[PDB]
């Protein structure tokens, strides 16, 4: 399961953290709600409120984010969207 | 296509508006990104920034919202999540 980054507006590092915190979440948790919950909680930890996470295969979105704090990427089959709107 | 409301924390009226603005979006637009885009733009219009919309069939989420400004519902087959985190 390699990551594709589809759209980012994110600190290159932060981008990695995210990609990391996702691979982990996907070990821990099988249900999407959990996975997204893991990664949200993480980032509110590492970086401040207020992050929102979406995970699935089948969805689109229209959303507003703080500059530099948005990322959207596959982890093989599964799509992860993560942003702060604080 | 009847609506099921799964979770709300929303002005009963607002709840309706949302449900309405969704049935419309689903006439207009076929791609999910558009649909969600329609409804987001709407609510930022009617009620202020800053709303985020997700639409699909297959996804879960972990997200933080302003009190009274969250709703999550099916429109038959298709799932709509809408909240302000302003």
């Amino acid at each position: 399961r390699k990551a594709v980054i589809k759209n980012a507006d994110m600190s290159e590092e932060m981008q990695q953290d995210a990609v990391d915190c996702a691979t982990q979440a996907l070990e821990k948790y099988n249900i999407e709600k959990d996975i997204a919950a893991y990664i949200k909680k993480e980032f509110d930890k590492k970086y401040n409120p207020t992050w929102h996470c979406i995970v699935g295969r089948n969805f689109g979105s229209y959303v507003t984010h703080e500059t530099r704090h948005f990322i959207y990427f596959y982890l093989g089959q599964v799509a992860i969207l993560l942003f702060k709107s604080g | 296509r009847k609506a099921v409301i799964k979770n709300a924390d929303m002005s009963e009226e607002m709840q309706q508006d949302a449900v309405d603005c969704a049935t419309q979006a689903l006439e207009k637009y076929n791609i999910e990104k558009d649909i969600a885009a329609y409804i987001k733009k709407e609510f930022d219009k009617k009620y202020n920034p800053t709303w985020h919309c997700i639409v699909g069939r297959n996804f879960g989420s972990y997200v933080t919202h302003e009190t009274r400004h969250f709703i999550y519902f099916y429109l038959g087959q298709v799932a709509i999540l809408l909240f302000k985190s302003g």
């Binding site: 507006d9 089948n58 689109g60 979105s61 959303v63 507003t64 500059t67 969207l81 | 990104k33």
Partner: peptide
């Protein structure tokens, strides 16, 4: 600043048949 973004997903097209 803030920016607004779409994200649709490419639900991996059904294998030819």
């Amino acid at each position: 600043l803030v920016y607004t973004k779409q994200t649709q997903t490419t639900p991996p097209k059904e294998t030819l048949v």
